[PDB]
Design a protein around this motif. Structure first.
Motif, short mmCIF file in Angstrom:
data_model
loop_
_atom_site.label_atom_id
_atom_site.label_comp_id
_atom_site.label_asym_id
_atom_site.label_seq_id
_atom_site.Cartn_x
_atom_site.Cartn_y
_atom_site.Cartn_z
N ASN A 206 -35.89 -28.65 -94.30
CA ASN A 206 -36.29 -29.81 -93.52
C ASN A 206 -37.30 -29.47 -92.43
N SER A 207 -37.73 -28.22 -92.32
CA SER A 207 -38.44 -27.74 -91.14
C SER A 207 -39.95 -27.69 -91.37
N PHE A 208 -40.66 -27.37 -90.29
CA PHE A 208 -42.10 -27.19 -90.34
C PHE A 208 -42.47 -25.91 -91.06
N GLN A 209 -43.72 -25.86 -91.53
CA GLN A 209 -44.38 -24.60 -91.85
C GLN A 209 -45.14 -24.18 -90.59
N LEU A 233 -38.92 -34.28 -80.37
CA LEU A 233 -38.06 -35.25 -81.03
C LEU A 233 -37.77 -34.77 -82.45
N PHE A 234 -36.50 -34.85 -82.85
CA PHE A 234 -36.05 -34.30 -84.13
C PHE A 234 -36.44 -32.82 -84.22
N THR A 235 -35.88 -32.04 -83.28
CA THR A 235 -36.32 -30.66 -83.10
C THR A 235 -35.99 -29.79 -84.31
N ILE A 237 -34.76 -26.72 -86.25
CA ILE A 237 -34.64 -25.31 -85.89
C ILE A 237 -35.83 -24.92 -85.03
N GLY A 238 -36.53 -25.91 -84.48
CA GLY A 238 -37.58 -25.66 -83.52
C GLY A 238 -38.88 -25.15 -84.11
N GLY A 239 -39.41 -25.85 -85.11
CA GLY A 239 -40.67 -25.43 -85.71
C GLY A 239 -41.83 -25.48 -84.73
N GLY A 240 -41.92 -26.55 -83.94
CA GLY A 240 -42.99 -26.66 -82.97
C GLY A 240 -42.86 -25.68 -81.82
N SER A 256 -35.43 -31.33 -75.82
CA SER A 256 -35.19 -31.36 -77.26
C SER A 256 -34.16 -32.43 -77.60
N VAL A 257 -34.45 -33.19 -78.65
CA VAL A 257 -33.56 -34.22 -79.16
C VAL A 257 -33.28 -33.89 -80.62
N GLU A 258 -32.07 -33.41 -80.90
CA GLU A 258 -31.68 -32.98 -82.23
C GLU A 258 -30.18 -33.16 -82.38
N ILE A 259 -29.76 -33.89 -83.41
CA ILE A 259 -28.38 -34.35 -83.48
C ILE A 259 -27.43 -33.30 -84.07
N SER A 260 -27.94 -32.34 -84.84
CA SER A 260 -27.09 -31.30 -85.41
C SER A 260 -26.82 -30.21 -84.39
N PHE A 283 -30.80 -32.76 -75.91
CA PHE A 283 -30.15 -34.03 -76.20
C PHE A 283 -29.76 -34.07 -77.67
N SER A 284 -28.79 -34.92 -77.99
CA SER A 284 -28.27 -34.98 -79.35
C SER A 284 -28.86 -36.14 -80.14
N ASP A 285 -28.30 -37.34 -79.97
CA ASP A 285 -28.72 -38.51 -80.73
C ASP A 285 -29.88 -39.21 -80.02
N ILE A 286 -30.97 -39.43 -80.76
CA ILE A 286 -32.13 -40.11 -80.21
C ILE A 286 -31.84 -41.58 -79.94
N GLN A 287 -30.87 -42.17 -80.65
CA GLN A 287 -30.54 -43.58 -80.47
C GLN A 287 -29.80 -43.85 -79.17
N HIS A 288 -29.32 -42.81 -78.48
CA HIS A 288 -28.65 -42.97 -77.20
C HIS A 288 -29.49 -42.47 -76.03
N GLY A 309 -42.82 -34.08 -83.11
CA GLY A 309 -41.62 -34.28 -83.89
C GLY A 309 -41.93 -34.78 -85.28
N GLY A 310 -40.92 -34.65 -86.14
CA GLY A 310 -40.97 -35.18 -87.49
C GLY A 310 -39.71 -35.93 -87.84
N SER A 311 -39.82 -37.25 -88.00
CA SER A 311 -38.66 -38.08 -88.28
C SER A 311 -38.10 -37.77 -89.67
N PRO A 312 -36.85 -38.14 -89.93
CA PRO A 312 -36.25 -37.84 -91.23
C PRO A 312 -37.07 -38.38 -92.40
N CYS A 313 -37.13 -37.59 -93.47
CA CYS A 313 -37.78 -37.99 -94.71
C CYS A 313 -36.79 -38.22 -95.84
N1 LIG Z 1 -30.14 -39.89 -84.86
C1 LIG Z 1 -30.75 -38.72 -84.67
N2 LIG Z 1 -31.04 -38.29 -83.40
C2 LIG Z 1 -31.67 -37.08 -83.20
N3 LIG Z 1 -32.02 -36.30 -84.28
C3 LIG Z 1 -31.73 -36.72 -85.53
C4 LIG Z 1 -31.10 -37.93 -85.76
N4 LIG Z 1 -30.95 -38.08 -87.09
C5 LIG Z 1 -31.47 -37.00 -87.71
N5 LIG Z 1 -31.97 -36.15 -86.76
C6 LIG Z 1 -32.62 -34.85 -86.96
O1 LIG Z 1 -34.01 -34.95 -87.19
C7 LIG Z 1 -34.43 -33.76 -87.82
C8 LIG Z 1 -35.60 -34.00 -88.76
S1 LIG Z 1 -35.96 -32.49 -89.69
C9 LIG Z 1 -37.38 -32.10 -88.65
C10 LIG Z 1 -37.15 -30.85 -87.81
C11 LIG Z 1 -38.43 -30.07 -87.50
N6 LIG Z 1 -39.49 -30.51 -88.40
C12 LIG Z 1 -38.18 -28.57 -87.59
O2 LIG Z 1 -39.09 -27.77 -87.36
O3 LIG Z 1 -37.08 -28.12 -87.90
C13 LIG Z 1 -33.22 -33.21 -88.57
O4 LIG Z 1 -32.97 -31.90 -88.13
C14 LIG Z 1 -32.07 -34.11 -88.17
O5 LIG Z 1 -30.93 -33.37 -87.84
#
Ligand SMILES: Nc1ncnc2c1ncn2[C@@H]1O[C@H](CSCC[C@H](N)C(=O)O)[C@@H](O)[C@H]1O
Length: 352
Positions: A206-209, A233-235, A237-240, A256-260, A283-288, A309-313
């Motif tokens: 799920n991460s960046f190159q 946003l959507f950090t 494993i911190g590609g950026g 950093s905003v990353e829910i895992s 931060f954890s959930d972006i929706q909060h 950031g990169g939103s979920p695909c």
């Molecule tokens: N509701 C939410 N709030 C915050 N992060 C969320 C989220 N739902 C999914 N995510 C996270 O968004 C990330 C998109 S993957 C992108 C991560 C980045 N490109 C990198 O370098 O790793 C996923 O890790 C996922 O855990």
DNA sequence: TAAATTCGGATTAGGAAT
DNA sequence: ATTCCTAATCCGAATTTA
């Protein structure tokens, strides 16, 4: 209809022709802040047109990261960065299968003409698939070469599941540390922090190159000689963050905003074992994460210079069999949460 | 019960021949 | 404008391991 470029070199890649040094960007798209959005290139019909419309109608920059590493990675990047005088982080990763996998030439058949891997995904090839390939090649081991129909069952499944030749008629998928290296991360960047091997595969795919992103973010180095405040946003494993680190761009602050949680553990681990003098806020959930907290953070630290950031695909990838419903899917709809947070930052940085 | 295993097609685009 | 092929693809979920 946005038609993807061929070759998918964006505004230019190293060691290839077609470099474009200047572009005209709409005025509604100008910084500050600089921003950088990423998502997969091969989306359902009309997805990037919707993304571009919500990101100030910036035409996306589609780059296949095969021009930076050994594994293809077709992604679209919307950003308002300057495109002139980019540079790559040294040394660049291995370009071909021969150099990326040195032990490969012992087991590689000569009817496998691959010099480049396909995209690194989150679901890895089966052990039963390696067996069905070993059994298919077994009755032809004293023949110099197996027939044609036996060959392309193996070749099509090796391409379909990104398998490398690791043993006698043994095609096995990539291991996590091999994915780490190809994706531009340091070795064992994702080993600890409570990450299981299964979780390592998903977080990596799920991460960046890093080299591709670092090449794009490299224009920031002359602009900020004293570091940047980063909104990640959507950090993941911190590609950026890794890209900015290899570019020698000081990170004064990273929100950093990353829910895992294991992803957040991987980032905090990376933050300490690189001895980052800046401050990391997780931060954890972006929706909060409310608009007021963003403004509150921006008033304490002085606004963000970069929002990356990169939103979920999940709901856009062709590998999704049950929920590839587009931008309004339950996870990829968080793209509009990215536009929400970004608009808060622009309000303070540029006005109106 | 965290971790590991396995298998599950469709949606795109492009080339090339009607 | 169709038909027909090759081709790539940041995946979900049910189930079993251990
Ligand atoms: N509701 C939410 N709030 C915050 N992060 C969320 C989220 N739902 C999914 N995510 C996270 O968004 C990330 C998109 S993957 C992108 C991560 C980045 N490109 C990198 O370098 O790793 C996923 O890790 C996922 O855990």
């Amino acid at each position: 209809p946005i038609r993807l470029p061929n070759p998918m070199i964006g505004f230019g890649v190293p060691n290839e022709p077609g470099l474009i040094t200047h572009r005209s960007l709409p005025e509604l798209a100008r910084g500050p802040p600089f921003f950088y959005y990423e998502n997969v290139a091969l989306t359902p019909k009309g997805v990037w047109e919707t993304i571009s419309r919500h990101l100030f109608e910036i035409p996306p920059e589609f780059v296949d990261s095969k021009y930076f590493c050994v594994a293809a990675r077709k992604r679209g990047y919307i950003h308002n960065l300057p495109i002139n005088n980019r540079f790559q982080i040294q040394p660049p990763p291995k370009y071909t299968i021969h150099d990326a996998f040195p032990l490969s030439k012992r087991w590689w058949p000569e009817w496998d003409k691959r010099t480049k891997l396909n995209c690194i995904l989150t679901c890895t090839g089966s052990a039963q698939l390696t067996n069905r390939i070993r059994v298919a090649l077994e009755p032809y081991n004293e023949e110099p070469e197996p027939p044609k129909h036996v060959q392309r069952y193996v070749i099509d499944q090796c391409k379909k599941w990104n398998l490398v030749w690791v043993g006698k008629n043994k095609a096995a998928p990539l291991e996590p540390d091999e994915m780490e290296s190809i994706l531009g991360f340091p070795k064992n960047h994702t080993r600890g922090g409570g990450m299981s091997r299964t979780e390592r595969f998903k977080s990596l795919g799920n991460s960046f190159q890093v080299d591709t992103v670092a090449y794009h973010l490299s224009v920031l180095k002359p602009i900020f000689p004293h570091g940047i405040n980063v909104l990640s946003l959507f950090t993941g494993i911190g590609g950026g963050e890794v890209a900015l680190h290899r570019l020698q761009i000081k990170m004064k602050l990273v929100v950093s905003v990353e829910i895992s949680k294991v992803n957040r553990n991987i980032l905090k681990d990376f933050w300490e074992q690189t001895n980052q003098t800046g401050e990391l806020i997780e931060f954890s959930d972006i929706q909060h994460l409310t608009n007021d907290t963003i403004e509150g953070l921006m008033e304490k630290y002085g606004g963000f210079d970069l929002v990356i950031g990169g939103s979920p695909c999940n709901n856009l990838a062709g590998g999704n069999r049950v929920s590839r419903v587009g931008l309004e899917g339950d996870q990829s709809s968080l793209f509009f949460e990215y536009c929400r947070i970004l608009e808060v930052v622009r309000a303070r940085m540029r006005g109106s």
